[PDB]
Amino acid sequence: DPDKICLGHHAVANGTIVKTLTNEQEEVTNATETVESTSLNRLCMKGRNHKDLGNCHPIGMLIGTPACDLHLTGTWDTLIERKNAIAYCYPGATVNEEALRQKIMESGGISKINTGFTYGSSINSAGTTKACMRNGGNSFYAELKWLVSKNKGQNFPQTTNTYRNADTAEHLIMWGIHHPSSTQEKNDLYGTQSLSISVGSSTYKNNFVPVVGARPQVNGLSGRIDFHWTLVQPGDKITFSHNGGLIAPSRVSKLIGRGLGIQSEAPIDNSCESKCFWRGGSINTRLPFQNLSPRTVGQCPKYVNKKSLMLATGMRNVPE
Amino acid sequence: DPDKICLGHHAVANGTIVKTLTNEQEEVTNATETVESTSLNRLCMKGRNHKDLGNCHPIGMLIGTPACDLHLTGTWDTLIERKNAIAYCYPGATVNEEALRQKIMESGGISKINTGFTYGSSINSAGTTKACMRNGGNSFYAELKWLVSKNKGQNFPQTTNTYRNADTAEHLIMWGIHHPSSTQEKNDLYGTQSLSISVGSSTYKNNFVPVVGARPQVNGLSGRIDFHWTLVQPGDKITFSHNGGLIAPSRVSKLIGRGLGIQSEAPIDNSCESKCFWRGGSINTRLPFQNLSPRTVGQCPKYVNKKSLMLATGMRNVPE
Amino acid sequence: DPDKICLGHHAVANGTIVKTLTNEQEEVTNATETVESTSLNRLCMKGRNHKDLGNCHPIGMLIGTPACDLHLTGTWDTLIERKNAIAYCYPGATVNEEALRQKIMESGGISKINTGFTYGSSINSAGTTKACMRNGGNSFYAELKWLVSKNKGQNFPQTTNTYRNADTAEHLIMWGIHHPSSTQEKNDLYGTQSLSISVGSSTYKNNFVPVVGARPQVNGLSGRIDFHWTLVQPGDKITFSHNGGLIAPSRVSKLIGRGLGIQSEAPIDNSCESKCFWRGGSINTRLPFQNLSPRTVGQCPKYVNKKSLMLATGMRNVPEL
Amino acid sequence: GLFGAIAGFIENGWEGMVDGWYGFRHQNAQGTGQAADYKSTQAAIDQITGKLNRIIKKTNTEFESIESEFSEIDHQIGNVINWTKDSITDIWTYQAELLVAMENQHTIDMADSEMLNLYERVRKQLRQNAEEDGKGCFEIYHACDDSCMESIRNNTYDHSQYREEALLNRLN
Amino acid sequence: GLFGAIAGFIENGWEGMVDGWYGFRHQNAQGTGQAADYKSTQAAIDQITGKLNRIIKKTNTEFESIESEFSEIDHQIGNVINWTKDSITDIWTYQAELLVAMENQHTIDMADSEMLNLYERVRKQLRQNAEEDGKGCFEIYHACDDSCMESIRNNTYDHSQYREEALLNRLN
Amino acid sequence: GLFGAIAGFIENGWEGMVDGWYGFRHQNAQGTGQAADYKSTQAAIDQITGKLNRIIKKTNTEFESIESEFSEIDHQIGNVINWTKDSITDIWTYQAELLVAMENQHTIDMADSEMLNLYERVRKQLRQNAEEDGKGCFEIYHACDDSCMESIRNNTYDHSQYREEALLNRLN
Numbered sequence A, B: 001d002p003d004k005i006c007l008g009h010h011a012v013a014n015g016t017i018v019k020t021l022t023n024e025q026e027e028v029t030n031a032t033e034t035v036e037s038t039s040l041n042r043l044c045m046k047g048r049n050h051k052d053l054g055n056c057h058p059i060g061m062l063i064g065t066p067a068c069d070l071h072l073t074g075t076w077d078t079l080i081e082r083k084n085a086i087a088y089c090y091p092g093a094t095v096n097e098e099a100l101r102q103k104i105m106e107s108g109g110i111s112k113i114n115t116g117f118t119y120g121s122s123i124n125s126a127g128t129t130k131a132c133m134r135n136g137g138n139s140f141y142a143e144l145k146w147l148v149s150k151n152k153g154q155n156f157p158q159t160t161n162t163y164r165n166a167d168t169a170e171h172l173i174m175w176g177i178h179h180p181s182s183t184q185e186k187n188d189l190y191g192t193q194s195l196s197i198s199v200g201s202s203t204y205k206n207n208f209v210p211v212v213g214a215r216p217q218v219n220g221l222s223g224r225i226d227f228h229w230t231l232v233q234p235g236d237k238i239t240f241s242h243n244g245g246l247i248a249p250s251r252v253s254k255l256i257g258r259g260l261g262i263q264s265e266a267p268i269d270n271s272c273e274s275k276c277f278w279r280g281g282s283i284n285t286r287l288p289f290q291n292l293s294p295r296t297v298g299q300c301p302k303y304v305n306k307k308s309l310m311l312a313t314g315m316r317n318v319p320e
Numbered sequence C: 001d002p003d004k005i006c007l008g009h010h011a012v013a014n015g016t017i018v019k020t021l022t023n024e025q026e027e028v029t030n031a032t033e034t035v036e037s038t039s040l041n042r043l044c045m046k047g048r049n050h051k052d053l054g055n056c057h058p059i060g061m062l063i064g065t066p067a068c069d070l071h072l073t074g075t076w077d078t079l080i081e082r083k084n085a086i087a088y089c090y091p092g093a094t095v096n097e098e099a100l101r102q103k104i105m106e107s108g109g110i111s112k113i114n115t116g117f118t119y120g121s122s123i124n125s126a127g128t129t130k131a132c133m134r135n136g137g138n139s140f141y142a143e144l145k146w147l148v149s150k151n152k153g154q155n156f157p158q159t160t161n162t163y164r165n166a167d168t169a170e171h172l173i174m175w176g177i178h179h180p181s182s183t184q185e186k187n188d189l190y191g192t193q194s195l196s197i198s199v200g201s202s203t204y205k206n207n208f209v210p211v212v213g214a215r216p217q218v219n220g221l222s223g224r225i226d227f228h229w230t231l232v233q234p235g236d237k238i239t240f241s242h243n244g245g246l247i248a249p250s251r252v253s254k255l256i257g258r259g260l261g262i263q264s265e266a267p268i269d270n271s272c273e274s275k276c277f278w279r280g281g282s283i284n285t286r287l288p289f290q291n292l293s294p295r296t297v298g299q300c301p302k303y304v305n306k307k308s309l310m311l312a313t314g315m316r317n318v319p320e321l
Numbered sequence D, E, F: 001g002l003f004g005a006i007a008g009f010i011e012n013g014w015e016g017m018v019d020g021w022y023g024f025r026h027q028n029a030q031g032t033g034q035a036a037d038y039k040s041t042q043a044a045i046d047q048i049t050g051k052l053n054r055i056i057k058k059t060n061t062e063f064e065s066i067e068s069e070f071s072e073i074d075h076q077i078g079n080v081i082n083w084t085k086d087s088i089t090d091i092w093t094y095q096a097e098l099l100v101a102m103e104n105q106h107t108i109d110m111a112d113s114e115m116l117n118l119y120e121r122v123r124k125q126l127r128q129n130a131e132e133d134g135k136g137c138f139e140i141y142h143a144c145d146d147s148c149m150e151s152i153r154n155n156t157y158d159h160s161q162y163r164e165e166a167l168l169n170r171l172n
């Protein structure tokens, strides 16, 4: 007999499952994903003055390995490092290597300044090696000089070289120490005297003695040249005191501004833009979380140990 | 005279206090603890192929200190280190000691491989000391050999020994350098010549020179034997070039797989299982949080600065 | 007509905007700030036995640089380091310098203990320099002695000095190596003999050789005195064997307990109190968060990347038309 | 649920209501009708849009690499980084889980409250002219044509117009 | 509290009700009785069980040592580790305290709502045959024997059976 | 809002009610009057004071320097510290934002519930002697002088005293 008005709410045939504080299997009308599972298999470089180093390793830019001849100076906001890139043509390594690599990979450019180092007539400063080929001929790291006695067997003279930082910004200076494979080789290059290299400034102090001894050939060579580095502040002097074994800098480096360092094998794409990168490529999602990798760079969604996390965008679904 | 039906809720005599967003002293019918504050003063090792090192320090396993004679090789998924464990019998220390200890404590076993190093007839390779007692008397580190001149005062011969890794996994090589108590002692053992020990692989190089400056006696001995170590990759060689002062390896080590390192003072219990350990024992709780210690290893509840946090499991308690 | 009773709630003319889970622009009757934006540009030291080092660098306290003469010993709960503080009067530097500074800035005091080192007739232990002025005269690091030959030219004798730690706590011992400016200078102070300094304890050993040669003048001086340090354990001894070049300790140091190290240029204020400090001063707030600096020490509000976060302390404001 | 309407005294949702989240169905002498309620529907949608605007977001903090992809880093430092990164990941995984669980509970209960508030608004409009059946409907004790039904939906229904007729029918 | 029933218009709980969380007491000619309501009780317990399943959990992340119990590590990295671990502990301590405070607020208010939802169900069942007491009771304006009281509890009370006479008793 | 009263069926607040958060306005033959409700006001204030006591605090963990202000740090270790500190700050910023958004939501809805609970209390007291107008008022169907109005505000109004005359006026 009475007329009737009924209050109700919508429903859908295919609801979605979400988790609440009290229920792991709560069916709602709609929901949306908060964890990103996909990435673009490319480095999205639109809006970035980027440098793809190819097979040049960042440290190779400072010392001047032949692979890095086109990357000795420049400017950039993004620096891309690739797998198996070359830093050391001659067998060896850098002391405090990762600190240096990260420093270069957050710069926005490199400039080179001459040390102005000259050497006496009893020093051959043009030592080369078959490990570092340039134009089909034996060469050496472009920013350094392999110093040896000009006459074979003769005592390398006590030498002093001082670089003044005349610039208003700090300069990064590198040098190497040669480690002969035998007593004969050491005597031929530097003489029979005890070898000592000291490097000193107001902000740095260290001593190096060439290691002489038999060891396995690396690319047919038992010798080693290990690299060392430090910063020279504006107005400060850094002095090298050496009598054999020093691989001396002919230029120093100036790191300019800021940039984002990316390590990835993914190909470049100038069409797309991104702010988040990882080994496998670019993450352009708007979502707050991601499950692709705990190792990302830039402005990124936070990594989580979750396949999916659904946020309800509707009421409980209560079908007919 | 109306009949009636009354709606109501339960209550309890012994209510319990919880904290809410708005009330510190909220009485509810029931609650349960979320922070574990009790521990088992025992290392729960059921289901674990474990090794309790006792008074043997992990580094002593590699060099073969008498305290570690029962732990020269082994397999395990869990390695237990004890307080005041012995690494060295003769006075001295390992360079880069903590990294070595941690690396051993990350392993699932140790195997030993003969170097096969041989020496000329003018070398005594069976040097021993009162500091390292084994069985009847004066002995040495089991995995090393103290090389001295057979004839007292004679120059130790220039010797070369090379170990190739013939395995498919990396080997950990250790050696020592003896630093004599005086010039006279140095001359007696190795002769009057300048001593030089050079070590070299594809990835490692170093020079060592025995030091003879006056220093105090440790258990009656002013001499020191310091240890050095490196990893040799599959197929690579490590060459020792020396003329007195080298404590040479008789065997090298292979760290097998991975395992959980525990540093604890608690005794073993093979009746109980656990995945979370600390200095004082094991944490077997189901609870999310824990107030025992910020230093734990394994799969653990999170440390919090709180004795108790009660989670309500019932309504407000409202008695008559 | 029925009589009426109406239920209502208050409102205000000037509501405040807050953010909720669902609304960025929610007007409420009242709110309060949770993020502190203001700092006192002053180091609030009320209720603290504090030491302001001023122009004295922490390492200068141990070697006894003239600027540190009033900071050679003492006790403190808070130690304040200033910018451009002086550690070294003579040219040179300490090996493992930052670790030493950190260790001192973690301490709650310093005591000094005599080494008891003595020297024969041929050693002049009172070497001084114009680089280290004190009372208008040439002086030296208060806790060290510059040993030279008494007769200029003569060989500095082979010498042994051993310090035993007779205390129940570890002692920090420092020494210097003089690196002469020329071969001529080396010969005048220590003689023509080749120089070598050995240092040996139960837990430490090292060898040092005076490197001789010309180098840039720091305040008209090419010579250097570089410093080294180690810890001597309770009951252990440390032996110096030397024949020229050693700058020997006359006292060793004992770091007492723990204290809060602060690095700041802000002036001291004993009127205000605080438990949180940073380069620019003190944060006295009761609030849970702050946006002044991510670089703070003490018991502090947590740094957040937010200018303001308003917590509602009232209902929705629904004003009248 | 918290407010007792959705998955509560309202038995189920309407699949055939495709132009709104909440609404009305009626029956009177002339026939039947259906209409969505715009205000309550929009109130629910706007609150959910607010959550999405807050949640679908990343920080603008620029992070650099501290782990080399193509070279070995120091073992002690690597262990510290691994401990720290895994700790940070446990925190974010936990925060993510809690955020979405908490928000999902609130979204569901908020939607329930909007249903109840519409129901309550209608109850108070009808006053003594109707009675609740317990299923989310009101039995109206007077002739209520399509115009009358529209006035209930659009909040312009004047109870005093029908009160005399309605009270007589209710008491019977 | 939020829903006004528990510690609200219901003055206190019943310690004698040991077979449920919510329920009924009644009065009629035949005497008095008590009975728990299973459905409301189980709704509250199931929701609390859901929280426990969520919360009483640890992560499955494997952590290894970055601090030596029995020896000294490098002082610089040790200070970084101490800063990091203490920062992590402050976060988890804060998260733990907020989690439990928020969950306890919700548990209490959820339980309050389940009481009100039962109360509201009974109100709508009784329709015009009863009036609210103000303290959680309904005064029923007709004779309601044990089978009638049971019909209210098990949700099968038909108001139309008693309506005619109930209305007359109310108007008097 | 969640409970439908504040910014709901109560059209707006009263700027002139300066001595309470919730209260009453009446109209009878003697005129009008206003009065705050102490108990509901204090219930809301106490809950907000509760939140302030929990939120307005810092941890007592003493942190020391791991970054030198006046000297350089190793670039690798400096980068680890920077990553860690920035990761910690992102967590605390997120946590702060979530805390205050969640608390603000609850504070507003709590205040709404206290308004509704006062309304519901008055509704049940008045019983069959008054009717709701839908705007937060009760039309009382008997002469209710200042002392009668006071008894409603003070929770001592006896519905049975006025029932006979009230029902006659409601039925007309």
Ligand SMILES: CC(=O)N[C@@H]1[C@@H](O)[C@H](O[C@@H]2O[C@H](CO)[C@H](O)[C@H](O[C@]3(C(=O)O)C[C@H](O)[C@@H](NC(C)=O)[C@H]([C@H](O)[C@H](O)CO)O3)[C@H]2O)[C@@H](CO)O[C@H]1O
Pocket (backbone or CB within 6 Å): B126, B127, B128, B129, B130, B131, B138, B146, B148, B179, B180, B181, B185, B189, B217, B220, B221, B222, B223, B224
């Ligand atoms: C010289 C003097 O009057 N007094 C002490 C002298 O006691 C001490 O010499 C050491 O004394 C201890 C006493 O237990 C041992 O006898 C040392 O001998 C051994 C050893 O057991 O360690 C003998 C062993 O055969 C030697 N092994 C080899 C391979 O050569 C070793 C070895 O030479 C040394 O350990 C190398 O440092 O020594 C004996 O040397 C010294 C302590 O420095 O101090 C004198 O002043």
Ligand SMILES: CC(=O)N[C@H]1[C@H]([C@H](O)[C@H](O)CO)O[C@@](O[C@@H]2[C@@H](O)[C@H](O)O[C@H](CO)[C@@H]2O)(C(=O)O)C[C@@H]1O
Pocket (backbone or CB within 6 Å): A126, A127, A128, A129, A130, A131, A138, A146, A148, A179, A180, A181, A185, A189, A219, A220, A221, A222, A223, A224
């Ligand atoms: C500056 C100099 O002496 N350069 C030499 C170089 C070095 O003497 C040597 O690398 C130091 O360790 O040696 C070069 O010659 C090599 C031989 O030493 C080696 O035995 O065989 C190599 C061929 O596989 C090679 O000929 C070199 O590295 O190229 C010659 C160079 O001028």
Ligand SMILES: CC(=O)N[C@H]1[C@H]([C@H](O)[C@H](O)CO)O[C@@](O[C@@H]2[C@@H](O)[C@H](O)O[C@H](CO)[C@@H]2O)(C(=O)O)C[C@@H]1O
Pocket (backbone or CB within 6 Å): C126, C127, C128, C129, C130, C131, C138, C146, C148, C180, C181, C185, C189, C219, C220, C221, C222, C223, C224
């Ligand atoms: C202990 C001692 O010999 N002190 C000398 C000191 C040292 O010989 C010198 O610093 C070691 O490098 O030298 C003092 O005199 C200086 C001259 O050596 C220097 O050539 O010129 C300086 C002026 O710029 C200065 O005169 C010194 O440093 O004061 C004299 C001191 O007794």
Ligand SMILES: *[C@@H]1O[C@H](CO)[C@@H](O)[C@H](O)[C@H]1NC(C)=O
Pocket (backbone or CB within 6 Å): B030, B031, B032, B313, E052
């Ligand atoms: C109290 O709560 C605990 C934890 O959920 C539960 O095991 C126990 O049965 C509860 N007690 C009662 C009487 O319900």
Ligand SMILES: *[C@@H]1O[C@H](CO)[C@@H](O)[C@H](O)[C@H]1NC(C)=O
Pocket (backbone or CB within 6 Å): D074, D075, D076, D078, D079, D082
């Ligand atoms: C850190 O974790 C990575 C990935 O899980 C692993 O490969 C690496 O060995 C770990 N680093 C150290 C030093 O154990």
Ligand SMILES: *[C@@H]1O[C@H](CO)[C@@H](O)[C@H](O)[C@H]1NC(C)=O
Pocket (backbone or CB within 6 Å): E074, E075, E076, E078, E079, E082
């Ligand atoms: C780290 O904390 C522990 C415990 O408070 C303390 O003993 C230790 O000194 C700290 N580590 C360093 C390097 O200061």
Ligand SMILES: *[C@@H]1O[C@H](CO)[C@@H](O)[C@H](O)[C@H]1NC(C)=O
Pocket (backbone or CB within 6 Å): F074, F075, F076, F078, F079, F082
């Ligand atoms: C760490 O961050 C600070 C502040 O932004 C910056 O000055 C410093 O250069 C950073 N350190 C490194 C090693 O990049």
Ligand SMILES: [Ca+2]
Pocket (backbone or CB within 6 Å): A106, D064, F079, F082
């Ligand atoms: Ca950086």
